[PDB]
Design a protein around this ligand. Structure first.
Ligand SMILES: CC(=O)O[C@H]1C(=O)[C@@]2(C)[C@H]([C@H](OC(=O)c3ccccc3)[C@]3(O)C[C@H](OC(=O)[C@H](O)[C@@H](NC(=O)c4ccccc4)c4ccccc4)C(C)=C1C3(C)C)[C@]1(OC(C)=O)CO[C@@H]1C[C@@H]2O
Ligand SMILES: Nc1nc2c(ncn2[C@@H]2O[C@H](COP(=O)(O)OP(=O)(O)OP(=O)(O)O)[C@@H](O)[C@H]2O)c(=O)[nH]1
Ligand SMILES: Nc1nc2c(ncn2[C@@H]2O[C@H](COP(=O)(O)OP(=O)(O)O)[C@@H](O)[C@H]2O)c(=O)[nH]1
Ligand SMILES: Nc1ncnc2c1ncn2[C@@H]1O[C@H](COP(=O)(O)OP(=O)(O)O)[C@@H](O)[C@H]1O
Ligand SMILES: [Mg+2]
Lengths: 426, 428, 312
């Protein structure tokens, strides 16, 4: 009943997915061995969305882990929750992508994508009613970008009437670890804009900013970043497995949030976020969640919504709360900030309410937004791309695998057309 | 005999039905298991072992809310085949609920209704609860109404709907669904009651003194209104009026069939004392512009007809005095072609209180249903919203990818314009 | 600039026995009144109109312009049994019954047979269809999933399509017949895929060393279907969904072009992407919508007229 198949590609995707599965298993009361040690029936009521049953009351995730190197695989396998995954769903090669989009999209990923498609097809035929697919990856690397793009294309060709939502970590301006990041990011967006239904944009800079400022953490590591991302991933699909006063599914959020087919790039957010030693001084009410959600310094994308207008906003609430308060807050947010919302669309906000809060909290909320301010991200990527492409720098690592310069020019033109599309409604 | 069939389609309909059936069970002394330790035949049928099964059908394209009904405290009350559920919902799309996902459980609900209608001798009408602006509640209701009109035809159909509010809204694509469904509800319905949530929030805040209401209070109020409508069929009293009398005294012309409901007194326990709460005081409160369950002041319009329903300890002399006082006032306008504009009904059964509720134990209550020319303001607001969104043709690609042409939008907008011009021309 | 013409047809004998009534009322030469609702176009023909007048008022200027190195596009929209094939094919050999395509090829070759001897001509012909959002070649059934790419001057083109040379009108008619043999057609003769025909006329002067290139597009669109009134199940429903979405996308592009919008959404469909060069800019495009005046076909006529009005 509305099952979700999960795919993790590359190092970033695999680590985010491991954190996500730990969080989801904690929410559903599942031990690392796959056993159930919960305290409520609602935990097991809709466990078929994310888990597959086994003999003797054991649950195996519907996840497929794919990489071109075994190091992340055997780092994930030996972790706290590595014993929960099916050993047959680990698909890996031996020669890595080498931070090359062309390699992972054409040469090494082509010889590995048949196995991934086979395991996906086996997993998807065991579903009573499929709802969509999830992919976690990074645009700036080689295996993530190219291989996930190829997988998305193949899956969209096979199943054209299903949701495809991706949580893609986007290259950041002030934080960088690769020299050939712009090439990969451009060549990846050129395909995401065509073969995806809704893509969530995340960058490490905003996550670092949240950790340093809101959480007051001293030395943040990748665990905290992956933890924030996992929290938002869990919050997106809370209405598929718990009851509530208003129910919103994936297709509902796509219908309400996407006015035109190209415009499906979102910036996520979460609330509440406080620091240890500062939760006793704060009251947790619906106004506080609303105030924190629409704050510029809480989005997980390194874009300022004040430099643009919202086309649509989706707010998903968890806990026990009044509908009058939610409606009033979502109306006064628009009334007070009329200069940040598109005029010809009335009621830019959609509300969903679920009645089971996250463990250890009384209330929570997730924020999905579609703003024209996302065009500055693509502008920076395009600027770097054009700067590096005039000299044809680092271009023989790509033309040595079976690529062409015309592909680069087409990707650049597609990105420019997307930017011009978004700029119209500003 | 006198029996009704209730349909609750969509999440809003199912929740309203939960409230309604809890209320009916408390009224008739029926435990949640169908055993009571002849005034219930309109809403219940005996099975021969003492069990009572409601004449209800619950429908939704999503397996969530009906599942809460299936494992709740009323799980042994409903026939397991009356609760019908699908696989995937309409996703706020009229077309999905109309054809693509509609043409999969429509035959099943039709078969269930045919089974229910064959087990009742004197069918009186249908009571359909749904929501404008949703996917299922707007699309699946259109298909269901079309087939029922084809099949039964002569039986009456009364619709209880949730209309979009002027300011408060939940979805982004509500105007499209509302326009299409209000084009569908003109031809097939016989009497339509529209209530918006913002007015009920205002009523809850001002009268009952609850600052943070939820959907349960709204559903309790709506259930009270429906029970006041059906009291005449269920119980006995002086001047009992049934469905056909309401229709013949409330609908002047075939298309002018969109009344506004009101209830009185909605008072709290603390303020229940300190007040006389007489017949005249209750009647006067039903014409105030702040007690209306739609966002429309009747002072910007003219009344055509109103039917007043009294339950409890009421005497006809007091009703006549109250009618005379109302007729004396100047702020209340009646059309020149309806010199007598009142229909009076009295029932001896006082309202029932539900444990864990906000309404107080009163000794008498009224429920006025009136069709005015002031119901055209909300339609105008919704049309403005629709045309603003449709000028850019936003979200239209979702609707045409499910097999819907682009001319349906223009046709429905034209139908709404024609209806508005009628309510304006009949007003003068 | 965009010109929209509407051509009606006389009631046939097979429907004169049913007592069907004419519904169309003509005002002047640019409006038609159906159900007391005006519908304004650039020119509205009547049943007495001849084929030659349609050619002279719809496609002569485009044919002359293409010969001067420019581009042009001609659409054709209609429901089944509405006059589409008669207006854009007609009798293939009757001098008084030929439609638009044979007249175009006749004029294009009469130009060649009368232009000195220092000019060299080559005619390239392509023919492909769009079925279920997939480009397919009608001259070679092996290719079925072609793609759209760009050149250096960002002028889109279809990669791998068959392009064959022709030297006489007979060859063009033969290739048209061969292409129509492989078009997806429902069970009377209803089309379920869009069809595009390219005639590339390139001339090179040997003396002045000047080259001119012109492309002419002839699009035969499929008609929108109201699924609720038909009962589509299976592949028919998928075809109906795809057709409706594509037609709406084309309407959006044409409206954006006519209203002078800064951004034109050429990339929201396969078809509009292909015709990026031949739709905007200094190109002449006309739309011919064909309807029927029978009372039995009021709704389909209304839909066709509404689609034509969407252009404006
Ligand atoms: C005493 C008390 O109330 O402690 C809170 C707490 O102090 C705060 C600061 C928590 C705390 O979170 C963090 O410090 C944190 C660390 C890394 C990354 C992200 C956050 C908390 O650790 C996190 C924890 O969150 C949960 O329990 C949620 O269910 C959360 N769980 C996990 O992320 C998780 C962690 C480890 C193992 C398994 C799951 C969740 C959120 C969304 C979706 C699913 C689950 C909570 C409320 C607390 C502590 C313990 C201090 C905060 O986080 C969350 C996710 O609730 C940080 O800002 C919020 C506000 C909370 O009040
Ligand atoms: N009174 C009341 N109104 C509700 C309730 N739930 C939703 N609504 C209203 O209904 C509208 C949303 O439509 P829904 O009924 O939830 O949608 P649906 O009919 O289930 O259709 P889909 O979910 O899209 O398949 C909004 O205007 C809500 O305010 C409820 O429980 N009580
Ligand atoms: N949040 C998070 N980001 C990561 C992690 N590892 C790498 N990244 C980011 O991912 C990008 C590098 O791509 P990477 O996945 O390592 O290359 P790949 O292994 O070839 O796919 C850089 O922007 C890194 O900051 C991780 O564990 N967590
Ligand atoms: N304008 C017209 N004048 C006279 N006859 C016409 C006209 N349009 C169509 N017809 C007649 O209609 C017949 C079939 O039309 P057809 O081209 O098959 O339409 P469609 O292709 O839409 O089914 C032709 O034999 C032709 O004689
Ligand atoms: Mg629902």
């Amino acid at each position: 009943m509305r099952e979700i198949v999960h795919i993790q590609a590359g190092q970033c995707g695999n680590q985010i997915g491991a954190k996500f599965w730990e969080v989801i298993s904690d929410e559903h009361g599942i031990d690392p061995t796959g056993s159930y040690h919960g305290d409520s029936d609602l935990q097991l009521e809709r466990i078929n969305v994310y888990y597959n049953e086994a003999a003797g009351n054991k649950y195996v995730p519907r996840a497929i882990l794919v990489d071109l190197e075994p190091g992340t695989m055997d780092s994930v396998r030996s972790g706290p929750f590595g014993q929960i995954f099916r050993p047959d769903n680990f698909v890996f090669g031996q020669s890595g992508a080498g931070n090359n989009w062309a390699k992972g999209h054409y040469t090494e990923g082509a010889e590995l994508v048949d196995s991934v498609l086979d395991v996906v097809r086996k997993e998807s035929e065991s579903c009573d009613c499929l709802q969509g697919f999830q992919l976690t990856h990074s645009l700036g690397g080689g295996t993530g970008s190219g291989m996930g793009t190829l997988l998305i294309s193949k899956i969209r060709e096979e199943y054209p009437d299903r949701i495809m939502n991706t949580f893609s970590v986007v290259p950041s301006p002030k934080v960088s670890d690769t020299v050939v990041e712009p090439y990969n990011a451009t060549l990846s967006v050129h395909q995401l804009v065509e073969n995806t239904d809704e893509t969530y944009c995340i960058d490490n800079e905003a996550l670092y900013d949240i950790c340093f400022r809101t959480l007051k953490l001293t030395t943040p590591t990748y665990g905290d970043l992956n933890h924030l991302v996992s929290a938002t991933m869990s919050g997106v699909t809370t209405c598929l497995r718990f009851p509530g006063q208003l129910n919103a599914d994936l297709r509902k959020l796509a219908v309400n949030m996407v006015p035109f087919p190209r415009l499906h790039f979102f910036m996520p957010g979460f609330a509440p976020l406080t620091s240890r030693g500062s939760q006793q001084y704060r009251a947790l009410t619906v106004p506080e969640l609303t105030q924190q959600m629409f704050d510029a310094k809480n989005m997980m994308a390194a874009c300022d919504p004040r430099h643009g207008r919202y086309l649509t906003v989706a707010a998903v609430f968890r806990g026990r709360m009044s509908m009058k308060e939610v409606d009033e807050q979502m109306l006064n947010v628009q009334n007070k900030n009329s200069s940040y919302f598109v005029e010809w669309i009335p009621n830019n906000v959609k509300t969903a309410v679920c009645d089971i809060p996250p463990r250890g909290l009384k209330m929570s909320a997730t924020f999905i937004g579609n703003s024209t301010a996302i065009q500055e991200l693509f502008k920076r990527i395009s600027e770097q791309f054009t700067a590096m492409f005039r000299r044809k720098a680092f271009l023989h690592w790509y033309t040595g695998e079976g690529m062409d310069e015309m592909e680069f020019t087409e990707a650049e033109s597609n990105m420019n057309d997307l930017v011009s599309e978004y700029q119209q409604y500003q | 005999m006198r029996e009704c069939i209730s349909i609750h389609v969509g999440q809003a309909g199912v929740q309203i039905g939960n409230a309604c059936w809890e209320l009916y069970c408390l009224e008739h002394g029926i435990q949640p298991d169908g055993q009571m330790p002849d005034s219930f035949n309109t809403f219940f049928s005996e099975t021969g072992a003492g069990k009572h099964v409601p004449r209800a059908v619950f429908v939704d394209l999503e397996p969530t809310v009906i599942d809460e009904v299936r494992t709740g405290t009323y799980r042994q009350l409903f026939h397991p085949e009356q609760l019908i559920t699908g696989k995937e919902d309409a996703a706020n799309n009229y077309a999905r609920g109309h054809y693509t996902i509609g043409k999969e459980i429509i035959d099943l609900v039709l078969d269930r209704i045919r089974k229910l209608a064959d087990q009742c001798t004197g069918l009186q009408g249908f009571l359909v609860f749904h929501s404008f602006g949703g996917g299922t509640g707007s699309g699946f209701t259109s298909l269901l109404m079309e087939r029922l009109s084809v099949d039964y035809g002569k039986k009456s159909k009364l619709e209880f709907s949730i209309y979009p509010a002027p300011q408060v809204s939940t979805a982004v694509v509500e105007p499209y669904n509302s326009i299409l469904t209000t084009h569908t509800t003109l031809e097939h319905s016989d009497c339509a009651f529209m209530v918006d949530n913002e007015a009920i929030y205002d009523i809850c805040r001002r009268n009952l003194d609850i600052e943070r209401p939820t959907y349960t209070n709204l559903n309790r109020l709506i259930s009270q209104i429906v029970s006041s409508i059906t009291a005449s069929l269920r119980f006995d009293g002086a001047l009992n009026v049934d469905l056909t009398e309401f229709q013949t005294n409330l609908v002047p012309y075939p298309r002018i069939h969109f009344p506004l409901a009101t209830y009185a007194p909605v008072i709290s326990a603390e303020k229940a004392y300190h007040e006389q709460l007489s017949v005249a005081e209750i009647t006067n409160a039903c014409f105030e512009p702040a007690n209306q369950m739609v966002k429309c002041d009747p002072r910007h319009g003219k009344y055509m007809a109103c039917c007043l329903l009294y339950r409890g300890d009421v005497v006809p002399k007091d009703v006549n005095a109250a009618i005379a006082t109302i007729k004396t006032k100047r702020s209340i306008q009646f059309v020149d072609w309806c010199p007598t504009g009142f229909k009076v009904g009295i029932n001896y059964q006082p309202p029932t209180v539900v444990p864990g509720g906000d309404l107080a134990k009163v000794q008498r209550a009224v429920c006025m249903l009136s069709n005015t020319t002031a119901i055209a303001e909300a339609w105008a607001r919704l049309d403005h919203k629709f045309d603003l969104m449709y000028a850019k043709r936003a979200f239209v690609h979702w609707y045409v990818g499910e097999g819907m042409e682009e001319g349906e939008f223009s046709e429905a907008r034209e139908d709404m314009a024609a209806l508005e011009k009628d309510y304006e021309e009949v007003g003068v | 600039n965009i010109k929209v013409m509407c051509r009606f047809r006389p009631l046939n004998e097979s429907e004169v026995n049913r007592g069907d009534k004419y519904i169309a009322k003509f005002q002047g030469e640019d409006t038609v009144v159906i159900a007391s609702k005006p519908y304004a176009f650039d020119r509205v023909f009547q049943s007495s109109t001849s084929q030659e007048q349609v050619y002279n008022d719809c496609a002569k200027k485009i044919v002359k312009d293409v010969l001067e190195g420019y581009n042009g596009t001609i659409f054709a929209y209609g429901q089944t049994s509405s006059g589409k094939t008669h207006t854009m094919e007609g009798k293939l050999h009757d001098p008084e019954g030929m439609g638009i395509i044979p007249r175009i090829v006749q004029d294009i070759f009469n130009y060649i047979y009368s232009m000195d001897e220092n000019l060299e001509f080559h005619i390239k012909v392509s023919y492909f269809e769009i079925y279920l959002d997939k480009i397919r070649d009608l001259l070679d059934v092996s290719k079925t999933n072609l793609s759209v790419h760009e050149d250096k001057n960002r002028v889109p083109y279809v990669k791998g399509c068959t392009e064959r040379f022709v030297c006489s009108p007979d060859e063009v008619m033969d290739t048209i017949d061969e292409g129509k043999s492989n078009r997806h057609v429902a069970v009377e003769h209803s089309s379920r895929s869009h069809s595009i025909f390219l005639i590339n006329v390139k001339q090179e002067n040997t003396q002045t060393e000047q080259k001119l290139s012109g492309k002419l597009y002839l699009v035969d669109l499929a008609g929108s279907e109201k699924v609720s009134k038909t009962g589509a199940e299976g592949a028919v429903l998928d075809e109906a969904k795809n057709i409706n979405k594509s037609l709406s996308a084309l309407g959006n592009v044409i409206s954006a072009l006519a209203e002078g919008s800064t951004y034109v959404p050429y990339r929201d469909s396969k078809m509009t992407r292909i015709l990026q060069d031949s739709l905007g800019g200094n190109c002449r495009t006309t739309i011919v919508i064909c309807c029927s005046p029978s009372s039995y076909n009021e709704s389909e006529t209304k839909s066709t007229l509404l689609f034509g009005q969407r252009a404006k």
